[PDB]
Design a protein around this nucleic acid. Structure first.
Ligand SMILES: [K+]
Ligand SMILES: [K+]
Ligand SMILES: [K+]
Ligand SMILES: [K+]
Ligand SMILES: [K+]
Ligand SMILES: [K+]
Ligand SMILES: [K+]
Ligand SMILES: [K+]
Ligand SMILES: [K+]
Ligand SMILES: [K+]
Ligand SMILES: [K+]
Ligand SMILES: [K+]
Ligand SMILES: [K+]
Ligand SMILES: [K+]
Ligand SMILES: [K+]
Ligand SMILES: [Mg+2]
Ligand SMILES: [Mg+2]
Ligand SMILES: [Mg+2]
Ligand SMILES: [Mg+2]
Ligand SMILES: [Mg+2]
Ligand SMILES: [Mg+2]
Ligand SMILES: [Mg+2]
Ligand SMILES: [Mg+2]
Ligand SMILES: [Mg+2]
Ligand SMILES: [Mg+2]
Ligand SMILES: [Mg+2]
Ligand SMILES: [Mg+2]
Ligand SMILES: [Mg+2]
Ligand SMILES: [Mg+2]
Ligand SMILES: [Mg+2]
Ligand SMILES: [Mg+2]
Ligand SMILES: [Mg+2]
Ligand SMILES: [Mg+2]
Ligand SMILES: [Mg+2]
Ligand SMILES: [Mg+2]
Ligand SMILES: [Mg+2]
Ligand SMILES: [Mg+2]
Ligand SMILES: [Mg+2]
Ligand SMILES: [Mg+2]
Ligand SMILES: [Mg+2]
Ligand SMILES: [Mg+2]
Ligand SMILES: [Mg+2]
Ligand SMILES: [Mg+2]
Ligand SMILES: [Mg+2]
Ligand SMILES: [Mg+2]
Ligand SMILES: [Mg+2]
Ligand SMILES: [Mg+2]
Ligand SMILES: [Mg+2]
Ligand SMILES: [Mg+2]
Ligand SMILES: [Mg+2]
Ligand SMILES: [Mg+2]
Ligand SMILES: [Mg+2]
Ligand SMILES: [Mg+2]
Ligand SMILES: [Mg+2]
Ligand SMILES: [Mg+2]
Ligand SMILES: [Mg+2]
Ligand SMILES: [Mg+2]
Ligand SMILES: [Mg+2]
Ligand SMILES: [Mg+2]
Ligand SMILES: [Mg+2]
Ligand SMILES: [Mg+2]
Ligand SMILES: [Mg+2]
Ligand SMILES: [Mg+2]
Ligand SMILES: [Mg+2]
Lengths: 51, 100, 147, 204
RNA sequence: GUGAAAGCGUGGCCUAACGAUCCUUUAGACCUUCGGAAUUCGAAGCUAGAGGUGUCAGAAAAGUUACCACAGGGAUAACU
RNA sequence: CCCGUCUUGAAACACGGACCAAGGAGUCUGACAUGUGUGCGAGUCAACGGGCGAGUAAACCCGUAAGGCGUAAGGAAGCUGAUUGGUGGGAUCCCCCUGAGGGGUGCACCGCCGACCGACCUUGAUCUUCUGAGAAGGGUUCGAGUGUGAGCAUACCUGUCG
RNA sequence: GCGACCCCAGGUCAGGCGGGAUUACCCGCUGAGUUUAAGCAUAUCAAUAAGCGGAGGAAAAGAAACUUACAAGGAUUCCCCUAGUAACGGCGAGCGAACCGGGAACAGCCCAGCCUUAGAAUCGGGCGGCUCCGUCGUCCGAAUUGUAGUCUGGAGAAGCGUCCUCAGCGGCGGACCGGGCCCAAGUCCCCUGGAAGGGGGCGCCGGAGAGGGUGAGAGCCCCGUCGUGCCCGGACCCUGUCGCACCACGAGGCGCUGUCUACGAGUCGGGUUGUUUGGGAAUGCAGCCCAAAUCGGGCGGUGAAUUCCGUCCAAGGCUAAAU
């Protein structure tokens, strides 16, 4: 038979987050990369990194 | 059609600008034909004559029923503008016919 | 987000939150705006007064550009001047800045609020209210008309 | 229908699902149009990629008459004033619009200067290699004969700076609101006043 | 209006005797609009009434089926 | 006493159900609304498109008088368009005093009453191009108004509607 | 009776054209009801499904009888916006465009009519030759009830002089599209196992750690993958360069000139009927009736007369791109 509520291509796939929020997210990520505790917490092996 | 006063309201309103006459165009003489075309149409009128309703209009103009002649013209042609132009044409034909 | 939809919390509860007695039938009150005068009369009168009927004159082929008339108030006029020009205004009291509101996308000047104290301004606009002109004049300014 | 809500007016009673236009090809359309422009630029090299020169025209209606934009093509009157025959203009990157009228001197003069500026920085290669004819350049075909990308005579706004004037007693006494009310009144009574004046002539 | 006057009178001594939208029609305002600009007709608006919905919060509406059909109802007849 | 179900009432002499496996029902989308999270804020939004770019359907950049919503309302319309708060309670803080105390401070919110803009009505010194201007002075009228903005984008639940 | 022309007939006459198929998109016609309105008839579903036709890689549309009322825009198409707006609607349910503005693309043109009359200057067919998508010669036809040139309103004809512009093919290369071929590094040692492609050890390639195959998780066993190099072909378009040729008689451009200055009819328009549209004293379309004009005609979203103003030039035709 026919499935319930058949999936349609015009589902709203995409999202447009405001540009200023996207820039906010990038800046936070860049700042987090300079914190060794956060970099280690994400699973990176930076035990021999000079700085 | 005076130059604009420079105010946004009132008569002759609008932004101040130096107006100039539009350059002449060939289409300005639309509705005018050559002398030959007038000659051809005049000759064909003699050969063809007048239509039955045109004969009715001129008969009314002979008895002086100008108002009724115009109403017949409007019923036939359709518009008042064309009806009164047609009546004047019939009057011109009759005017120079009684003088001959 | 399907996992937050409350129907998921209602799995295993038979009626899916729509009751055993009343049930969830197709259109038990008609579709859309049906019965606006008959069985939804109270709803329309209580929440939508004026809904039914006709008022005013028709306007065939009404173009909105003819009616374009953005307005700016007196209190907002000073904010249009650039900051560097504001300093010049306070540096020489003999002259006054010329604020052409049309250059900032405004046609008419309304008269809400007050102008900066001790600062004459020459306002250039298509239209102006009488209160706006009075406030400009009493501050030492003047009004010029344009189009 | 229930509660206090805006009256719904969804236009979804036809077979709308058969007329849905998706935009999943939007990135592909951008790619295809960019490729077409890139291909066109090489075809017309060294002619500018911006295309033909367009005139400056005013926006239409009261809402947009304060701005200027690119029009279709230069009017015949503008071309004649600039001394460029209309049949030659399209062959040297000048758009021609035989329909546009010129109601004012300012509009005519603005585009005439635009044409002269364009001709100042226009390099025309000869039709045949060696022999050089009128209108062609000489020694400039190699110096600065490059394909210009983007606009070369942009149509932009030049907002005037705030000017500080001296307030004269004449301007202080001017009654702007009174002027507007008087002008409005004279406009809507123009017909009635002209009527009685004509009727007075009949009596007199 | 009435009474000398206080005062009384916004229908009937009090408790019933009546009617939306749209449309039509009338009254009123040296009123507004017909959007290229005018004049006069015509039309369209604004305010207050009238023409009615008695199933009276107001669809425009005759039967028959023993040839019958469907969704239901023990919310409801024909047994115990 | 047999579960499920409609029901005032089911173990019912009310209906479904012999048994097992697997499949099997509030979803997607448009509009709007309240609430909450986030960004910015009298602004906000990269949305058509362009410039590009992980050799790339992503990400990144672009709003020059673009546009949407907001920033001003009232009126059928012609049109006109906010003179910029008083008071009773009240959070917090400050001082005195150590009382269910007395002063200063008075945000948010609520009650009460003015003023301002507009429809309608009313009013008119003094002027004017005769129909407009407006010194003063208004109203048991009316408004989804003003009296130092709060919006815009976005995410999701719930609700109405197609 | 013999001839010319006209109309028609026959032909297995010589040489051509047409039918049918396909459905995603496209063009024309025809055309419902379920449904919604909590009933129902206008309405809505829908100018949709079904039905009947016709095309192409796109189709259709297209160079204003336009928008607008502004300081004006300027063929068509398409996107955003306009806007769920003006409007329409048992003004109920519902329905609903357009202009401006911002963008994608961009391209303009051809006829009919007065104008060879010292020459039908035009075209087809048969036959023949050549450098063969054509061209030349010759013959027979078409055509004066008009072929070719000139002209298309933006103009133009004619006259005058400024003395500006205009005449081909070929060789090579690039660009473009398609294909073919070669080309990196372990299968080293131990253990488990039917099998190592697994674990441990020791190495290597990497502009190639996409993917697949091979007896289990394989960059290095195999095909490929990355990046060059080499080779072959198709389009004849665009473009660079070289060689040869290069007659301005004529035509065009520019300037001036008294004069001339031809533009689509049972069509426009009007009445009426039906249908359709947001189009409302009537948006388009169609039937029937009436039936134009040439200093004129159409439009300017309320019917009508009068005075102006703005605007365009229908009743013939072609046309790439954005979709
Ligand atoms: K519920
Ligand atoms: K698509
Ligand atoms: K009833
Ligand atoms: K049950
Ligand atoms: K039962
Ligand atoms: K049972
Ligand atoms: K609600
Ligand atoms: K904005
Ligand atoms: K931009
Ligand atoms: K009113
Ligand atoms: K031949
Ligand atoms: K493998
Ligand atoms: K002609
Ligand atoms: K019609
Ligand atoms: K005209
Ligand atoms: Mg429960
Ligand atoms: Mg249930
Ligand atoms: Mg219910
Ligand atoms: Mg529902
Ligand atoms: Mg349906
Ligand atoms: Mg444009
Ligand atoms: Mg008395
Ligand atoms: Mg009574
Ligand atoms: Mg009544
Ligand atoms: Mg009425
Ligand atoms: Mg009009
Ligand atoms: Mg009742
Ligand atoms: Mg029956
Ligand atoms: Mg019972
Ligand atoms: Mg029971
Ligand atoms: Mg039970
Ligand atoms: Mg029992
Ligand atoms: Mg049952
Ligand atoms: Mg059973
Ligand atoms: Mg299962
Ligand atoms: Mg929110
Ligand atoms: Mg804007
Ligand atoms: Mg008023
Ligand atoms: Mg007031
Ligand atoms: Mg044969
Ligand atoms: Mg129904
Ligand atoms: Mg029903
Ligand atoms: Mg029914
Ligand atoms: Mg079909
Ligand atoms: Mg076919
Ligand atoms: Mg084909
Ligand atoms: Mg294409
Ligand atoms: Mg075509
Ligand atoms: Mg034309
Ligand atoms: Mg156009
Ligand atoms: Mg809106
Ligand atoms: Mg429809
Ligand atoms: Mg546009
Ligand atoms: Mg000829
Ligand atoms: Mg010539
Ligand atoms: Mg000539
Ligand atoms: Mg290999
Ligand atoms: Mg190893
Ligand atoms: Mg195995
Ligand atoms: Mg390669
Ligand atoms: Mg024509
Ligand atoms: Mg007709
Ligand atoms: Mg039909
Ligand atoms: Mg065509």
């Amino acid at each position: 038979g026919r499935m319930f509520a058949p999936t349609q291509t015009w589902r709203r796939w995409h999202r447009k987050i405001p540009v200023n929020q996207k820039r906010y997210a990038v800046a936070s990520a860049i700042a987090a990369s300079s914190v060794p505790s956060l970099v280690l917490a994400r699973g990176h092996r930076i035990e021999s990194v000079p700085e | 059609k005076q130059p604009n006063t420079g105010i946004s309201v009132g008569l002759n309103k609008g932004h101040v600008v130096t107006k100039k006459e539009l350059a002449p165009r060939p289409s300005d003489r639309k509705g005018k034909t050559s002398k030959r075309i007038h000659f051809v149409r005049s000759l064909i009128r003699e050969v063809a004559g007048f239509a039955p309703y045109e004969k009715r209009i001129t008969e009314l103009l002979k008895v002086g029923k100008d108002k009724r002649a115009l109403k017949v013209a409007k019923r036939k042609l359709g518009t008042h503008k064309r009806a009164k132009k047609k009546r004047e044409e019939m009057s011109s034909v009759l005017r120079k016919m009684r003088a001959t | 987000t399907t996992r937050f939809k409350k129907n998921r919390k209602k799995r295993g509860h038979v009626s899916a939150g729509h009751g055993r007695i009343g049930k969830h039938r197709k259109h038990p009150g008609g579709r859309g705006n049906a019965g606006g005068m008959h069985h939804h009369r109270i709803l329309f009168d209580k929440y939508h007064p004026g809904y039914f009927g006709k008022v005013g004159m028709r306007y065939f082929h009404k173009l909105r550009n003819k009616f374009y008339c953005p307005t700016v108030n007196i209190d907002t006029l000073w904010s249009l001047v650039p900051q560097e020009v504001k300093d010049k205004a306070a540096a020489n009291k003999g002259t006054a800045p010329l604020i052409d509101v049309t250059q900032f996308g405004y046609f008419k000047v309304l008269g809400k609020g007050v102008l900066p104290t001790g600062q004459p301004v020459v306002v250039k606009a298509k239209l102006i209210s009488k209160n706006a002109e009075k406030k400009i004049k009493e501050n030492g300014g003047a009004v010029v008309l344009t189009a | 229908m229930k509660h206090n809500n805006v009256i719904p007016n969804g236009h979804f009673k036809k077979h709308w699902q058969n007329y849905v236009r998706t935009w999943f090809n939007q990135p592909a359309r951008k790619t295809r149009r960019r490729a077409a422009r890139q291909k066109k630029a090489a075809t017309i090299f060294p002619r500018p990629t911006a295309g033909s020169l367009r005139p400056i025209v005013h926006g239409q209606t009261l809402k947009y008459n304060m701005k200027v934009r690119a029009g279709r093509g230069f009017s015949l009157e503008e071309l004649k004033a600039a001394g460029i025959p209309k049949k030659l203009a399209p062959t040297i990157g000048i758009a021609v619009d035989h329909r546009r009228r010129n109601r004012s001197l300012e509009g005519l003069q603005t585009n005439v200067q635009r044409l002269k500026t364009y001709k100042a920085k226009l390099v025309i290669f000869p039709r045949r290699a060696k022999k050089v004819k009128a209108g062609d350049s000489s020694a400039e075909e190699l110096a600065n004969a490059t394909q210009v990308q983007g606009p070369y005579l942009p149509i932009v706004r030049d907002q005037p700076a705030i000017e500080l004037v001296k307030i004269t007693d004449e301007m202080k006494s001017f009654k702007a609101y009174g002027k507007l009310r008087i002008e409005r009144t004279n406009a809507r009574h123009f017909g009635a006043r002209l009527k009685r004046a004509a009727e007075a002539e009949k009596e007199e």
